[PDB]
Design a protein around this ligand. Sequence first.
Ligand code: SAH
Ligand code: SAH
Lengths: 241, 241
Amino acid sequence: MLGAIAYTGNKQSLLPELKSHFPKYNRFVDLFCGGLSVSLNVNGPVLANDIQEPIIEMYKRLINVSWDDVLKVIKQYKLSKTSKEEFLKLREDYNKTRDPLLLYVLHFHGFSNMIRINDKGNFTTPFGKRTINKNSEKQYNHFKQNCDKIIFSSLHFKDVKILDGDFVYVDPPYLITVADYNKFWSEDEEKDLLNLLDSLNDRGIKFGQSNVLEHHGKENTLLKEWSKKYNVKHLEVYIFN
Amino acid sequence: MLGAIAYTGNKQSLLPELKSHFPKYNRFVDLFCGGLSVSLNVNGPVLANDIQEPIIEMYKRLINVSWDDVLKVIKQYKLSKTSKEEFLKLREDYNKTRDPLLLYVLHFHGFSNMIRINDKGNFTTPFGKRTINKNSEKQYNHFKQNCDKIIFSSLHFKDVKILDGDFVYVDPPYLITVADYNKFWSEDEEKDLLNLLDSLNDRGIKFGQSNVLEHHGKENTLLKEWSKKYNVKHLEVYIFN
DNA sequence: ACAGGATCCTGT
DNA sequence: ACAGGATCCTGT
Ligand SMILES: Nc1ncnc2c1ncn2[C@@H]1O[C@H](CSCC[C@H](N)C(=O)O)[C@@H](O)[C@H]1O
Ligand SMILES: Nc1ncnc2c1ncn2[C@@H]1O[C@H](CSCC[C@H](N)C(=O)O)[C@@H](O)[C@H]1O
């Protein structure tokens, strides 16, 4: 259902389907949570993880923050649909101080609500000629009313203790797809992950996996094959074991 | 809402507002209907009027015509996004035969869908390097599904029997604005109209009036004053009594 | 400056 | 999750 923040490639729509293919588990470990549309909406306990400390931090802070808190920032900087300088300044400040909340308030004003953090910790998204709508408070609330069951981590899937009896939903950057986070992926990672996956299968530990096998001419050769070894659903495919 | 044909200065947007300021009436008499965005969308009975026979006729014919009818013409002349000769020929034909339907099919291909009839009955708009889009069928349908309540007339507002108990929305050529039909207006007409309006006020007969009081340096001096005597809304002003 | 498509947004 | 109305965008 509803995620925490607009996230490119959210699972606000497929989730239901996917949920029709999930098992039992002592702990849901979302290896790639990003938006959180998946974590917030799956019986816990949940280990929300994402290799981007910035956004995880923001989540960690969002924990003890009120809507009123957010507003006080908008009014503090005089943000709005047209406030361009302000946004810059707000961005300016977040870059220097790195206060999560700032980042949070930030994105709502970024070009297409997209959080884009470069390799120096700076927020580069341009002004979105926007502000907060009504999905803003609704999304926010969901998180609040469901963040309890979640345990965040800003680890790289590589080093993430997978404690037996836990389902591991994994929606990694689609190799054959565009998106800010594809700047983190490499063919190697693809390999690693898969191995790392076969490995979880070797411990009875079941998992879920979403991806694209072929999109816009290209196709994920190596993955297309690797999938055969397991079940695949077509809705975009969910390769689960 | 949706008019019958793209018309410079349509009221597809203001209408709602304007309707928020309308009274009851036994007959809606649209003195300047042009595009029809106003007639088709106002509880009838409606007297759609415009001093341009050609476009009114087109309407009168449109009455008993089907979309399929329109297409048969397009295929008949082999019209398209690039068919320049054809357009000319089609125009060529409409000029000679003066068949409304031809004119109808015509404009969809004219430069900016603009119907421009000179003082000799000829269509002069140049080829628009276009053809029919999505809005073409949609606009068409609206008319069909709403033309019933309308009674057309190709009269000059001067001689138009205003039968008591009728609201008279009047969107005449804006004196201080450019547009093909401004070739019909003169400062005198402005005077006349206004008198003609005060006169309807003298019979309890209420009316609606849209115009621009000041636009691009210029201002409708004489009108700006005349308006004070009545109510004025700012959205462009609707001077109603 | 406008159309008309694209997408956004909101309530439901 | 949708409808479709309200906005954003962009080729003329
Ligand atoms: N090398 C890497 N290791 C771990 N996580 C990574 C990674 N590269 C990217 N990621 C994270 O995984 C995300 C995949 S996209 C998010 C999908 C999620 N279902 C959603 O609704 O949010 C990336 O945005 C990034 O946050
Ligand atoms: N002397 C005159 N008598 C009557 N109608 C006239 C006129 N001079 C111009 N007109 C008509 O008045 C129209 C005003 S245009 C208004 C268009 C209409 N609001 C719609 O929404 O499309 C002109 O296009 C022209 O057709």
